[PDB]
Design a protein around this ligand. Structure first.
Ligand SMILES: C[N+](C)(C)CCO
Ligand SMILES: C[N+](C)(C)CCO
Ligand SMILES: [Mg+2]
Ligand SMILES: [Mg+2]
Ligand SMILES: [Mg+2]
Ligand SMILES: [Mg+2]
Lengths: 508, 505, 505, 508
């Protein structure tokens, strides 16, 4: 069984990985990793928001099945994740960094978690479909990220990611000490960074890399509120866009700091791979690179995620290591496919994972078997007033919301999604394609039931959360375990025996 | 708003509370409490097993709605409980003792929990409908409790309940120090004991009280396996009955220690009442006495719970205090009614709890209003191979399982449930009644959907639990909060100011 | 090896134990214990203040040797205590309650400590010989305890002692589960209550016992400030006496509540004895009753301790159990003798404890052997401006401070210490006696070296403590160990095996 | 008040810093630091063993005064340290890394401690003068460090120091967030590394730096046991030297890994200085570089410390920052002088520190005032059977032990200490110098009282420690504080307010 290193980042627009990292990015370590990787060019999040995407990523199940509809929805402990599947199959599993799990279980199958979460574990960020049009200023996104972009040497997120990286490398060194033990468990380490999620604020060393950057304005500029589709209008209102004057210079500084933060992350990828190389674990390790959702980065005038346009819904996905053919894949894939792919790579049978996953293993794709299943997406959090669903199949993207006109995009002819073919069909094939996706949408979702489930989940939480914020608060944040009395040299040990056990490689 | 003291005990057969405690029980404090209480004589659990009964009790929802089907089913943190409803209404809420919550949330709305649980918080005790007939010896009930009954001065349970009682009285004293602050929150303290749950082992002082006891033998004796109904057979097999020779003296020793442990609990009830009296909180405090399920106590040859017969499904319920007229009520009620009753007594509107509770407030009954809503029960754990449901309405009890012959009992004519009127109707009224209950059951439950939901829950947990028991174990047991650097006299305080604040009256 | 139960109380005037508890005290359990005890009637503290007395008590060394001169002096972890000596000899050792250890070590050899301390563990209460005459209002004794005496159902101290008692009895029950394992360690449990230390506030049930009490007034009344000896004057000033109008009824209420809190403690003594009896450990258990210092209780107009007069310096001491002949002993003894007495009773050789203890075993006295070693006492805390030492030998008490007139009392002729024979000798024998005590004092103490050592200790702590109270505070208070994932039933265990191991007998 | 960064390392032979780091060392960051520093060439430990040196360093008091005679002697909480003095004067004080404090107080005035200790906090390593000639194999030094030298990518010590460095830099970044607050406290951060203490085992990257090294054998080779002075013989026996065949190749590999570990440390010095530079704190920060004791590194056949020869007793000392003239100082100085120097640099009056320190401030030396006080040293731990004391004054070193012949060395004429002038006086001046040091030794120490105090301390601890190791053990190791429920974003906070507070510099 190979080891598995999952490197996850937050809010990375997948269009920036057209074949590994785009040429204009300063990302030597991810570009070298890409050359060894199977690269999934048209890979999609299952839900364009952090906690829904991550609960879905961990379980290989859509939000409608995990019930994690938004950033404050409880993730049940009894739902199997890839950590459970691998752990059941004999793996040591650990997590360093972010997973935005909501509720008192902060492990969800991981055997060890090295850091707390950057974001809350409670029900505070619960949307309310009963009050459509409201926004909550103390936690909603707003365009102050765009007007406040710039340069700093420490931020909340850089403190977080510096520690995620350090503790992940330390864990790799600790794991190497078992390398000569025949009975060692294989390990699976998830390293989950919060960058390049906003605030768009970068260390000067990486900001300086992009002085001459030619990609600091999006190709598709800002669409006026009156000319926007209804969901994009709800997003603009939820970002408080009327109270911010976003200048061309703000757009450029935001994109520049965001690319700088990709370079910041690239340096950390290089450290992890260096640790794997020096500890002699690299040849036996699969490395997966992934992200939870994208960032519109100013395209169409939109920032952040919460929608199904390419910039928000596309995320990179790369896999390298023993048995993976390097190459670029164009067939659309999904984050839903990661858990069954990890299971397959770990030698777990198809039947063991079948009842628990909605995705498919990508290993047959890597080995030249055509993948035909569509890619599905869902959204049911802030800036929605009712659930949205999307189907990505072939060259098409279809988006449905009971409250909105449908959207249909031909991404081969119209990759910037500038022409809505459900509104303006080019001909008879477009009308037939629309009818096919409507039948497909009825085959996969009951949208009235979906809306009812989301409403009940929100209503429960608002009752419970109001109570939990009265009186003494009981926090659910993960606290990494304390072990000082068993670490380093203690006087129930023999010093020479301890030193030999902690040294690796030995006798060289 | 009144204070609320909830005294809960585990595995207390409600037939032993015919009008408060039975005369033969040595329970002077519970009898004095019962004399000033509204007493609900025909009160039922929602599910005859610890965790399902308690999750249902806390939420006022049936197991099919809470999804807590068995003793290892996760209770979701987002489900509102009476703790949430009261806390939201401005109560300080606390738990001392047992609640058998499964999963990483060990508070479920309680603001403070003073003890860990006596039982596990993880998925270990998950049944498996895919292996009907199996038993898990290391945690199933077995008849060894009956053959091992007797006397001891300490047990696992007595250690637990001694501490539960101590910390509850300590908390009451602590709360009394706020009794002169007009800004004080009203409090709701749940004190949840593990007795008289088995092992049937009692301290000598309480065992000696039942030497001449006339109730050491059940009136309905053991029914041989071949004459038992199918569910009773499944229970006997689950208890490993074939590997135990249960003598008459075994039966007598078990009941004697069980009664003795009721007397053990009665002394602790008196301690709490005493604390309320001397702190001068008694007149402003509602007191509820309740249990999660009963114990067959050898009746029909069965022990423990897991069934809908009276001894297992009946539990006492009493309410006393400000605005509570004392009296005996015979209309059937259930534990499902406690959470809406608590909300009503705390002044919460019916509309605030209507979407979250499926029982009804008993406060109208206390004030003379006739109740007509039937009582529903569910069971889907060990010794079931498919879910069972029951309906209790008027004089009738109806029990359905897709795998078993139906049962119908007329509890006025047949209080010991010796004649199954579904099999042996007395005439056309019994047949019409059976048809009426079948139609009512079909309107309330799809038993095939219920069975699918339970199997899905079991299978899910078996994947997860096998993973969680590999590698380093992460426990979910509640650990009461460590406060030593802030307790008593510390040198950021003024000693005189501290002594005055801690003195009451 | 016998078990050892040490019952310690705080601030108990030893004159109230003339032969066990005084007849007028309602203390049936302590009187029954005293009837089977060796009782040491003329027993003295080593230092009339909490932390110095207790550090001296634990080590069997005087404050000049432990360096614990006052209530804020660090007790070094390397100093052997009776806990170390017994633990080294194979005992499990535990503490429930108070010991007023100062510094980051809150165990000092105890293997387990069941409660935090009621008092601070840091250097806050450090006196300063550089500012003679100052008082620190936020922690000094003051006469407000006398004017504030009365009745309450909870206090800071009653919360503390209720918990001390509960956890001690719980621990005894836990220890009984090992009583049938031949490989068991013998145990030594120290149960250390804060009562009858002030505030003089009692529960109504115990206060009502002293309604017709004839001992509510001390026989020796208040001595006016100008007629007081210099040290007594320093105590009255330290207590802020000028700002309190202490009436006769104040005096009576304080003594009444103090006696009532002795009765409060007596009920807890009976609880412990009951636990030992029902667990069948009583016959194999030594029981020691002791106190750290006394309380003047208004005698001479003084309250509390900090002096060498009988009411402040006398503390009871009793020993009962296997191999202990009951009887009354009048030869002076001291708390310094407890640690070598415990070691001797546990079978530890005299040579193993000789280098670490400066008292003597009382076991020879119990067996009829005359004791001749004198009793020494020291004091160097608040209301002293330089150290004081005392010698107690035969009928005599001698008290020296470089700043004050000497005191010499003949306690046979003058048990209330009303005639200072150093100032008013009766004849040449008194003068020769004074000279003999002066020579003995000079051989035992260099008072100038003692004073330099105390000032150095105070000054050191004042530099350190001012730093430690800047920025984030790091508390040294003991936090009892969190064990919830290993207590009661957990799913790495077999339930039947667990129930059997936790049941005893 | 300037900030103060104290960089401490363990077991660094001071002869390797002849004027900053020796030319042959690969240490660019320490060499650049040295060019800005006042450098104390003839600086001495106060006691050649870890815990005695460190308790003495913290208090500015000799072991005879601190009572910390050996590696298991309790350090009383009531003894003032430089952390107390600075904290009382308004400083935030923190420690990352090792201080080998014995006893339940693991802070000794530090307001925060970021790591546990690498070594035990209990009484286990207590020598026993009642059994002269015994050794305790499970914790005594032995020459297996020399025969086991080599190359590894992780060791006990590298795991420790990697975390010391990471958490120290993180603390600097956190402290920078207060930089614009007028009411900020100044900070004093001690960063205390365990390298280059043995095992002599280094990462390959740094080992490779010394392939051509010309210093891999000591100038003074191994002295046979019969030809050794009595204390050196006791050290050889305590190291179990008879059971090890130390080859020339072992000597070279040990020295090579030790120099590699200096280079490992030099990289961490560079990171700390980079953090100070980017956070804009460097110009207001004093940087002190120091060590607890040396390492003989094979010289005379000896390894490790425990003696007063130059290699064991000399340690580097450098100070750089506002108001310090750079330059090299030859007058002998002591680690005892650090606490009163820090006090002086922080503006604390001489009188405030006078009753609590045995050393003198070095600031007047830096400013051209001649220092005349001698340097004193003491040793009373393993391989001593009675206390040893030493005086270093002018060109002389004098060593006294009641059980041994005296030693007298003229370090100007005889810098390798090859001629004992107390045994072979060159003339009448040598005999007069010996008599002067004897009178000086009687003026500073009562050696019989010293021996009695050490004996009583050992005897107490053996009683107590035997008891503490019966039954359940209560550990004293420092456990760094848990704060997950107050870290990063929690839902009692406003997200925008949090991000602004955690970003620094702001608005750039
Ligand atoms: C990331 N935000 C918290 C700003 C909004 C997502 O719920
Ligand atoms: C460093 N050693 C532990 C090996 C010896 C010093 O006491
Ligand atoms: Mg995200
Ligand atoms: Mg139960
Ligand atoms: Mg006291
Ligand atoms: Mg060292």
């Amino acid at each position: 069984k190979p080891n598995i290193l999952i490197i996850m980042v937050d809010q990375l627009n997948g269009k920036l990985f057209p074949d590994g990292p785009a040429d204009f990015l300063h990302a030597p370590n991810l570009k070298a990793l890409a050359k060894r990787s199977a690269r999934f060019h048209n890979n999609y999040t299952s839900s364009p928001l952090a906690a829904p995407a991550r609960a879905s990523f961990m379980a290989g199940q859509l939000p409608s099945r995990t019930r994690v509809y938004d950033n404050a929805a409880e993730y049940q402990s009894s739902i199997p994740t890839y950590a459970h599947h691998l752990r059941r199959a004999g793996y040591y599993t650990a997590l360093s960094g972010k997973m935005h799990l909501v509720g008192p279980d902060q492990l969800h199958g991981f055997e060890e978690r090295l850091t707390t979460d950057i974001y809350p574990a409670d029900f505070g960020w619960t949307p309310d479909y009963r009050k459509p049009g409201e926004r909550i200023d103390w936690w909603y996104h707003n365009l102050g990220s765009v007007t406040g972009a710039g340069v700093a040497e420490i931020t909340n997120q850089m403190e977080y990611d510096d520690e995620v990286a350090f503790l992940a490398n330390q864990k790799l060194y600790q794991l190497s000490r078992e390398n000569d033990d025949e009975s060692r468990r294989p390990w699976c380490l998830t390293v989950s960074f919060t960058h390049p999620h906003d605030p768009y604020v970068a260390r000067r060393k990486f900001w300086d890399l992009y002085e001459d950057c030619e990609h600091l304005t999006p190709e598709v500029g800002a669409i006026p509120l009156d000319e926007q589709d209804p969901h994009s209008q709800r997003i603009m209102l939820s970002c408080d866009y009327q109270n911010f004057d976003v200048t061309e210079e703000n757009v450029r500084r935001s994109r520049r700091a965001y690319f700088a933060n990709i370079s910041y992350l690239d340096e950390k990828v290089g450290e992890l791979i260096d640790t794997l190389t020096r500890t002699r674990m690299l040849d036996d390790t699969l490395i997966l690179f992934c992200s939870d959702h994208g960032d519109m980065l100013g395209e169409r005038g939109l920032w952040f995620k919460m929608n199904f346009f390419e910039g928000s819904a596309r995320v990179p996905l790369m896999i390298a290591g023993p048995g993976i053919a390097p190459g670029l894949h164009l067939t659309p894939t999904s984050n839903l496919d990661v858990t069954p792919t990890l299971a397959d790579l770990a030698g777990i049978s198809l039947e063991e994972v079948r009842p628990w996953t909605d995705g498919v293993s990508l290993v047959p794709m890597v080995n030249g078997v055509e993948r035909t299943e569509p890619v599905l997406m869902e959204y049911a959090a802030e800036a929605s007033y009712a659930p949205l669903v999307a189907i990505r199949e072939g060259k098409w993207k279809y988006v449905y919301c009971a409250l909105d006109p449908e959207q249909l995009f031909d991404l081969e002819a119209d990759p910037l999604e500038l022409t809505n073919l459900a509104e303006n069909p080019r001909g008879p094939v477009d009308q037939a394609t629309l009818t096919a996706f409507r039948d497909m949408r009825a085959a996969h979702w009951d949208m009235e039931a979906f809306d009812a489930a989301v409403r009940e989940s929100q209503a429960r939480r608002w009752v419970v959360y109001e109570a939990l914020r009265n009186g003494a608060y009981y926090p659910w944040d993960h606290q990494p375990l304390q072990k000082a009395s068993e670490r380093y040299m203690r006087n129930h040990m023999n010093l020479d025996t301890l030193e030999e056990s902690k040294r690796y490689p030995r006798g060289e």
